[PDB]
C-alpha cells in the first residue's frame, strides 16, 4: 500500500499483472510493463512536496518526473517522463477513498488512467466512475533508516543495532536476483580467500563498495540509497563478516550474504553478531 | 631496527644507500637495489618460527622464501627466492652483537653477505670479521593492531579507539604514492558526489575495497593486511565520511584522506570523529 515517502511498484488495479515504467520532438511517455520483468524504470521514488497528500514521482533509473504533458486538462494529454520544472504538472495527489488509491494532477484534477487497457497507453482523464482504469496499487519497496535500525533491534538473529552513515536515508531493498547479479559481476566468488591479505572483512567491503557502484551507475536519481551492511560475528571457532539485507515479501527479515560465494542464510551460519554497519 | 614478526627493508650496512629486493635455468636471486626506487619486491615478510630468533623471511610480492640454494654452504652460494619448502636453508637466525644486526642461515652457519661493494651480489659466506659486508640494518614498515590501537587512542584529532576486524593483525603501512596509486585507478576521483546515492560513506568503502583489491591482487605472500581506515565525523554543517592512515615517517601520525578527491589532512578537516574501523 502507499505510505508516502519511498520507493514503489505503482500497478494497474484494472487489468492484473500490469506496472508503470518510463520508455527508453516528444518525451519518452510513461507506460504499461509487464510483471514477469523487472526492469529498473519500473521503480518509482515518490517524495513528499507541500501540502498533505501531495508529491513528486520521479523514475529512480531515468531520473526524470512524471509529468501530464504541457499542463493540459484534455481527456488523453500523455503522462511523461520530464527534467524536473517545479510545474504543478509534476506534482501529484495520492490519496485513496475507501483503499481505492488514486493519481490526480494537482495543477488540472485530472487522473493518471490506463486508457484502452500488452495494449494500453498512460494518460491523464477526467474522473471515470463506470470502470477502475484510474485505480492503482503500489508496492513499497524502500525502508527509511528508522525502519532498518528498528528490524535490527526486533530481529532474533541480531537483537541489536547498527550504526548507519546517513541519519535519515531512504534505502531501497534489492531482490536477490539484483543482489546475486551484483556478487557474479564482482568476481569475488573465484577470488581465494588468503589470512589477512584477503580476508572475510575484505569480502564484505568490497561487496558493499560493489552494491554502491551498481547503484551509482544505474539510478540517475538522487535521494536514497541502497541498503547493504556489514557485520562482523563469531561463535567458538573464530571471527567471521558477512553482509546483510531485508527481504521485499517481509522487511522485518534481515537476511545475512556470503560475499566468499554468493549464498544467503536467515541466522548467519550461527555466527553471533558483535559490531556492524549499514 | 629488527623489532621480530615484521614487514621491512632489508638494507645494506657496507653499500650506502642500497636494499634487498627479488629481481624480475634459474631461481631468481636475492639482489641488491637501490634505496631510490620503491618496487615492491623490496619489501620482506618477517615470521618467527621454531627456536629464538629464527625467522622465515618472505618476498610480500613474489610470495617465495630468502633460500639459500641448497643447504651448500659453499662461499659465494646464492641467495634465492624459492617456494616455500619447510627446509632449514629457509630458516634465518636474526640477531645483533653490536647492535650490529646479521642474518645467518639456521642450517649451514653462514651468513647473508654483500660481495663486492650496479654490482654486488647476494651470496652466503663464512664469518668475515675485516669489512662490514655481513651487517644488515632492518627498517620497520609495519604496525601491529595493538599498535594502531594505540595510536588512535592518543591521536589529538581523534582521543578514541575504533573496531578492527582483526584482532592481532600485522598491518603494512603504505606510502602516499602507492595510496595516490590505488586512488587514481578506483576512479573515484571522477565520480561526482550525489545526495545519498553515491554519498561519502560509499567514497570511503569503495576506496577500502580498492586498497584491499590491490594488496589481494600485489601480494602473493599472506599473513598480513594494508592498513586502510574509516571514519564518519561531523561538525555543525553535518556529517562527512574519511579514509584513514598512519604515516611511514612517523606511525603514531595518524592522517586522513578525502577519497572524492584524493587530498590528505593531518586534522580530518576539523571533522570530529565518532566512529570507525580497520
Ligand atoms: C642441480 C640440482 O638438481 N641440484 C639439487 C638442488 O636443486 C636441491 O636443493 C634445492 O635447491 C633449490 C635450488 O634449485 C635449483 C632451482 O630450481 O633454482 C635447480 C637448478 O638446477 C639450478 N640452476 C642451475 C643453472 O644450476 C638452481 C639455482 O638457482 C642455481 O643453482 C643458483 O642460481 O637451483 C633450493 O635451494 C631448494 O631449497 C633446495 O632444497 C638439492 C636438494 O634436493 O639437491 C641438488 O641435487
Ligand atoms: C504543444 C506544445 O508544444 N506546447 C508547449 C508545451 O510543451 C509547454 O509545456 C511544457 O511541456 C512539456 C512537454 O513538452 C512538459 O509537460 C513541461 O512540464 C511543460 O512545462 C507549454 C508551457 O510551457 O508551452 C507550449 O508551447
Ligand atoms: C511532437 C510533439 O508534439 N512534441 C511535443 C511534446 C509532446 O506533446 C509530449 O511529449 C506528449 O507526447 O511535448 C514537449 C516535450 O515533450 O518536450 C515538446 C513538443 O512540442
Same mark, same amino acid.
Request: aromatic letters at 14%.
Given at each position: 500500500?502507499?505510505?508516502?515517502?519511498?520507493?514503489?511498484?505503482? %500497478?494497474?488495479?484494472?487489468? %492484473?499483472?500490469?506496472?508503470?515504467?518510463?520508455?527508453?520532438?516528444?518525451?519518452?511517455?510513461?507506460?504499461?510493463?509487464?510483471? %514477469?520483468?523487472?526492469?529498473?524504470?519500473?521503480? *518509482? #521514488?515518490?517524495? +513528499?512536496?507541500?501540502?498533505?497528500?501531495?508529491?513528486?514521482?520521479?523514475?529512480? $533509473?531515468?531520473?526524470?518526473?512524471?509529468?501530464?504533458?504541457?499542463?493540459?486538462?484534455?481527456?488523453?494529454?500523455?503522462?511523461?517522463? @520530464?527534467?524536473?520544472?517545479?510545474?504543478?504538472?509534476?506534482?501529484?495527489?495520492?490519496?485513496?477513498?475507501?483503499?481505492?488509491?488514486?493519481?490526480?494532477?494537482? =495543477?488540472?484534477?485530472?487522473?493518471?488512467?490506463?486508457?484502452?487497457?500488452?495494449?494500453?497507453?498512460?494518460?491523464?482523464?477526467?474522473?471515470?466512475?463506470?470502470?477502475?482504469? !484510474?485505480?492503482?496499487?503500489? !508496492?513499497?519497496?524502500?525502508?527509511?533508516?528508522?525502519?532498518?535500525?528498528?528490524?535490527? &533491534?526486533?530481529?532474533?538473529? &541480531?537483537?541489536?543495532?547498527?550504526?548507519? @552513515?546517513?541519519?535519515?536515508? #531512504?534505502?531501497?531493498?534489492?531482490?536477490?536476483?539484483?543482489?546475486?547479479?551484483?556478487? !557474479?559481476?564482482?568476481?569475488?566468488?573465484?577470488?581465494? *580467500?588468503?589470512?589477512?591479505?584477503?580476508?572475510?572483512?575484505?569480502?564484505?567491503?568490497?561487496?558493499?563498495? /560493489?552494491?554502491?557502484?551498481?547503484?551509482?551507475?544505474?539510478?540517475? /536519481?538522487?535521494?536514497?540509497?541502497? &541498503?547493504?551492511?556489514?557485520?562482523?560475528?563469531?561463535?567458538?571457532?573464530? /571471527?567471521?563478516?558477512?553482509?546483510?539485507?531485508?527481504?521485499?515479501?517481509? $522487511?522485518?527479515?534481515?537476511? $545475512?550474504? =556470503? +560475499?566468499?560465494?554468493?549464498?544467503?542464510? /536467515?541466522?548467519? *551460519?550461527?555466527?553471533?553478531? @558483535?559490531?556492524?554497519?549499514?
Amino acid at each position: 500500500s502507499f505510505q508516502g515517502h519511498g520507493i514503489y511498484y505503482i %500497478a494497474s488495479a484494472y487489468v %492484473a499483472n500490469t506496472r508503470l515504467a518510463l520508455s527508453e520532438n516528444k518525451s519518452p511517455d510513461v507506460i504499461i510493463s509487464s510483471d %514477469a520483468v523487472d526492469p529498473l524504470n519500473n521503480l *518509482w #521514488l515518490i517524495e +513528499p512536496v507541500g501540502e498533505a497528500d501531495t508529491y513528486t514521482v520521479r523514475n529512480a $533509473f531515468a531520473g526524470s518526473y512524471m509529468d501530464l504533458a504541457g499542463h493540459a486538462a484534455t481527456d488523453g494529454t500523455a503522462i511523461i517522463g @520530464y527534467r524536473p520544472t517545479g510545474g504543478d504538472n509534476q506534482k501529484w495527489i495520492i490519496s485513496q477513498i475507501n483503499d481505492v488509491w488514486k493519481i490526480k494532477s494537482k =495543477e488540472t484534477g485530472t487522473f493518471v488512467t490506463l486508457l484502452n487497457g500488452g495494449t494500453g497507453t498512460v494518460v491523464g482523464w477526467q474522473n471515470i466512475t463506470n470502470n477502475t482504469s !484510474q485505480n492503482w496499487t503500489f !508496492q513499497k519497496l524502500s525502508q527509511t533508516g528508522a525502519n532498518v535500525h528498528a528490524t535490527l &533491534l526486533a530481529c532474533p538473529a &541480531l537483537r541489536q543495532d547498527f550504526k548507519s @552513515y546517513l541519519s535519515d536515508g #531512504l534505502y531501497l531493498v534489492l531482490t536477490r536476483d539484483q543482489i546475486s547479479s551484483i556478487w !557474479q559481476a564482482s568476481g569475488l566468488g573465484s577470488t581465494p *580467500w588468503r589470512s589477512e591479505i584477503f580476508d572475510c572483512d575484505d569480502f564484505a567491503t568490497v561487496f558493499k563498495g /560493489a552494491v554502491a557502484k551498481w547503484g551509482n551507475e544505474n539510478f540517475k /536519481a538522487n535521494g536514497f540509497a541502497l &541498503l547493504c551492511g556489514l557485520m562482523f560475528g563469531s561463535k567458538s571457532s573464530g /571471527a567471521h563478516a558477512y553482509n546483510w539485507f531485508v527481504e521485499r515479501g517481509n $522487511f522485518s527479515t534481515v537476511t $545475512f550474504f =556470503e +560475499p566468499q560465494n554468493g549464498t544467503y542464510s /536467515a541466522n548467519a *551460519w550461527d555466527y553471533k553478531a @558483535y559490531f556492524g554497519l549499514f
